[PDB]
Amino acid sequence: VLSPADKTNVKAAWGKVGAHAGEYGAEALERMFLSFPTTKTYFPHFDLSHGSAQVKGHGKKVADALTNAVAHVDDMPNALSALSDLHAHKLRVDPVNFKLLSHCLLVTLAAHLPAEFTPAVHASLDKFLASVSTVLTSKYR
Amino acid sequence: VLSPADKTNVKAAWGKVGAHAGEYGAEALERMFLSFPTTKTYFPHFDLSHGSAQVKGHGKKVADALTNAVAHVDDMPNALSALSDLHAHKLRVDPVNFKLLSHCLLVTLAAHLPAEFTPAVHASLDKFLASVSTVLTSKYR
Amino acid sequence: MVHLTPEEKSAVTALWGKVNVDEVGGEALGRLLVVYPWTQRFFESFGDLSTPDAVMGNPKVKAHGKKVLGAFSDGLAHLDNLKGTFATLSELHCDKLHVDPENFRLLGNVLVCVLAHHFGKEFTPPVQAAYQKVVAGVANALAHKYH
Amino acid sequence: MVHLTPEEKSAVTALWGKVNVDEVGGEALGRLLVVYPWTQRFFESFGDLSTPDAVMGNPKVKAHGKKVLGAFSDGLAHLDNLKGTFATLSELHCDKLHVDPENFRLLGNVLVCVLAHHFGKEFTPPVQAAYQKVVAGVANALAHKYH
Numbered sequence A, B: 001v002l003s004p005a006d007k008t009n010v011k012a013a014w015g016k017v018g019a020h021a022g023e024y025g026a027e028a029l030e031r032m033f034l035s036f037p038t039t040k041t042y043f044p045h046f047d048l049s050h051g052s053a054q055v056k057g058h059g060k061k062v063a064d065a066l067t068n069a070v071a072h073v074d075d076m077p078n079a080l081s082a083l084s085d086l087h088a089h090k091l092r093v094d095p096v097n098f099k100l101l102s103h104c105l106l107v108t109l110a111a112h113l114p115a116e117f118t119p120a121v122h123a124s125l126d127k128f129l130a131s132v133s134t135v136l137t138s139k140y141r
Numbered sequence C, D: 001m002v003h004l005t006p007e008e009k010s011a012v013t014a015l016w017g018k019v020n021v022d023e024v025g026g027e028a029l030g031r032l033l034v035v036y037p038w039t040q041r042f043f044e045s046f047g048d049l050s051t052p053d054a055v056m057g058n059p060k061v062k063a064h065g066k067k068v069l070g071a072f073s074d075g076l077a078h079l080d081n082l083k084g085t086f087a088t089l090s091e092l093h094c095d096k097l098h099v100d101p102e103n104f105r106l107l108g109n110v111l112v113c114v115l116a117h118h119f120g121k122e123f124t125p126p127v128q129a130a131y132q133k134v135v136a137g138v139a140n141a142l143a144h145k146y147h
């Protein structure tokens, strides 16, 4: 469960992400594809080369969804409903992969938010991404 | 989320377990210790020899908790509140280990319920154990 | 994968001799598709997978199960060299089929449940332990050429 | 276990030359205890672990952190024989300490986070990938003698 301090941490850190959210979403995917090559099996239709516009575009979508989640932190399941439907019924990404992206998002934030990426903030962000992951995988079976 | 059909499946299978719950809980532990030796790291204070009173007693307490959960499948969080506190604050078992015991409980039920362990019941029990695991890990952070 | 003691090897070979490969193959693949429905993503060309019954009775599922467990079966003769034995298959699953190796682990656990259901009390804790090592071994061998 | 392309190797080595083991070690262990609090079960004798500030400022956490990363640094020097290198410590962690090897994986991930935090833009996607391989290697080496 996200405590009030968790919610404050998340909104503050994401606040600072601001306009770079899209750039960071792409970087996180890039990190994921290089570090955990099995994740590439879900994007056989993409050009996964460094700088790919497909990765950049997808990065923006992932980022926008996370912004939406931050904005609706008290009402995540409803806000992410269509996305939970999509992952469960069409994309069908193994639940294990969510932990890999989550880690990569964390690494990306750490690399860009020296000041804000405190141990307390790190913990809150990890809890937040696990909550998002839980919701997205909620309707798998 | 357990569907109403899931709930029916679980109560049916567990009903059949009946009075052997405790002997089954012990066998599941022995299966876990043998197949996933890293789980022994949480029981250095136990005589883990086959048929030890410690393992039999522990197997019984595990089975009782499961029975409690089946009885209160609509309100698991509340029913297992005390056990979730114990696991989060005292035992502090890494969450990965819940998946290993759940798998060994599934194998145990499969080996003892030939007639009842249909694909649909298997699916329902898998989800049920995942839900129990989630509730027990709920208060970790 | 880990250590198979000659005893643990023998316990594997002995039970396997009693397996109906085609039957267990169909059962394990069908149960994978029922228990972890996301795995159905590769099989939309197999037709009707709407219910447990439809899955378990689908002839394409049964036929694919037979193929998969037949290769598994052949691997049991090469416990000493799984990586070599599964290299080309590893490559194919990565490069052409795009199958997340996590599916091999899921199948392995479903297979263990199937054997347990099939063998009852003969599937003892030590026998399970040996098969766990084999299923993890096979999964590792199939994921080895992923890149 | 670690398969490193020449480039990934020199990448690893170059970054490690700039790490203050003392400082990064204390950071990595403290963050582990904060982010995954259940890991505190091995350090009951370390003092106050009650809040992030208590954890991060604990001298025993700082001391232990230094010890662990120093042993970790030695592995960097024997990337080709991680298992031989860590055998003794593997046994110690199993037999005397009773540490679930899953903890080695959590620490490896926290370490990556710490390096990214410390080095910023220099910790590029390819560099991270090389470190992920190393960390997995190390954790595997440490879990090797478990029984």
Ligand code: HEM
Binding pocket: A039, A042, A043, A058, A061, A062, A065, A066, A083, A086, A087, A091, A093, A097, A098, A099, A101, A132, A133, A136
């Ligand atoms: C924080 C976790 C995640 C979030 C918020 C997220 C969000 C999204 C969004 C917003 C889309 C676009 C949907 C649309 O086109 O309307 C999408 C699609 C997709 N996602 Fe997820 N995703 C997450 C995790 C994952 C993971 C871990 C994987 C696999 C490794 C994955 C694989 C895909 C794929 C393959 C698509 C379709 C992309 C395309 O065809 O362009 N996602 N996701």
Ligand code: HEM
Binding pocket: B039, B042, B043, B058, B061, B062, B065, B066, B083, B086, B091, B093, B097, B098, B099, B101, B102, B132, B133, B136
């Ligand atoms: C289905 C999941 C589980 C259930 C329902 C469960 C239930 C229980 C129960 C009822 C107790 C006894 C509480 C008491 O004495 O009042 C207990 C204790 C304990 N459990 Fe859990 N458990 C589960 C998973 C695990 C796992 C996966 C592990 C480690 C691999 C574990 C390790 C322990 C330990 C070490 C104790 C302390 C027992 C002693 O010192 O006698 N549990 N658990």
Ligand code: HEM
Binding pocket: C039, C042, C043, C067, C068, C069, C071, C072, C089, C092, C093, C097, C099, C103, C104, C107, C138, C142
């Ligand atoms: C023990 C694990 C497995 C083994 C030994 C195995 C083996 C095989 C073999 C021998 C083939 C035929 C290759 C050929 O065309 O020459 C095949 C194809 C295939 N496998 Fe695997 N497999 C395993 C697990 C899986 C899993 C878990 C999935 C997905 C859930 C999967 C998906 C596929 C698909 C989609 C094909 C192509 C089928 C077709 O074109 O008709 N396999 N596999």
Ligand code: HEM
Binding pocket: D039, D042, D043, D067, D068, D069, D071, D072, D089, D093, D097, D099, D103, D104, D107, D138, D142
């Ligand atoms: C990078 C992986 C790790 C390495 C290389 C490592 C190395 C070491 C070394 C060199 C020692 C000193 C042994 C001695 O007393 O002679 C030690 C002790 C210890 N380690 Fe590990 N360690 C690692 C990860 C961990 C993790 C993740 C944990 C648990 C979270 C852990 C728990 C301990 C404990 C409890 C001790 C005993 C300290 C004491 O006596 O108070 N270690 N480790």
